[PDB]
């Protein structure tokens, strides 16, 4: 069983790498985890502390792995007023769209009544594979709020 189910979302695998890396740090922090590839709303209960991670294909298109979640949310707009979530966008950051794919997924969670925790992370993958600002630092700020 997990207590922070991550919601991995890439076609390339970049979000799967970041999700696995984050999940390891969470396990060392003492919290149980899972790395659900592209789950749907009908496979997530209305209460929990989730962590949505999405590639951005350069144009704001969410990867087809996870993009149906945006549609499943807005089509049903259930009460989700006890979901907490985190949000990460990943992509080649020199593109015109700019870790913006994640915004749609978080917005419909927010609209359904959920709320974010921490702040939204950006992860450039064009040139480096993140250089210098670990997701580990951001995760520290997160566990400090979700406790």
From Swiss-Prot:
Obligatory cofactor(s): FMN
Domain Flavodoxin-like positions: 4-143
PROSITE patterns named in the record: FLAVODOXIN_LIKE
InterPro entries noted in UniProt: Flavodoxin/NO_synth (IPR008254), Flavoprotein-like_sf (IPR029039)
Domain of life: Bacteria
UniProt keyword annotations, A-Z: Electron transport, Flavoprotein, FMN, Transport
The keyword Transport belongs to this UniProt entry's keyword annotation: yes
Keyword match Cell inner membrane: no
GO molecular function: FMN binding
A GO biological process held by the record: regulation of cell division
One Gene Ontology term, aspect cellular component: cytosol
Residues spanning the membrane: none
Assembly and oligomerization: Homodimer.
Function: Probable electron transporter required for biotin synthase activity.
PANTHER family registered for this protein in UniProt: NADPH OXIDOREDUCTASE A, NITRIC OXIDE SYNTHASE-RELATED
Family: Belongs to the flavodoxin family. MioC subfamily.
Protein name: Protein MioC
Organism, as annotated: Escherichia coli (strain K12)
Lineage: Bacteria, Pseudomonadati, Pseudomonadota, Gammaproteobacteria, Enterobacterales
Gene that encodes the chain: mioC
């Amino acid at each position: 069983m997990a207590d922070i189910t991550l919601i991995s979302g890439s076609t390339l695998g970049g979000a799967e790498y970041v999700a696995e890396h984050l999940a390891e740090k969470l396990e060392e922090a003492g919290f149980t985890t899972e790395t659900l590839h592209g789950p749907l709303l009908e496979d997530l209960p209305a209460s929990g502390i989730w962590l949505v991670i999405s590639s951005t294909h350069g144009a704001g298109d969410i990867p087809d792995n996870l993009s149906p979640f945006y549609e499943a949310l807005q089509e049903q707009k259930p009460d989700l007023s006890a979901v907490r979530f985190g949000a990460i966008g990943i992509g080649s950051r020199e593109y015109d769209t700019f870790c913006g794919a994640i915004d749609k997924l978080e917005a419909e969670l927010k609209n359904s009544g959920a709320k974010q925790t921490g702040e939204t992370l950006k992860i450039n993958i064009l040139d480096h594979d993140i250089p210098e600002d670990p997701a580990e630092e951001w995760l520290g700020s997160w566990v400090n709020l979700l406790k």
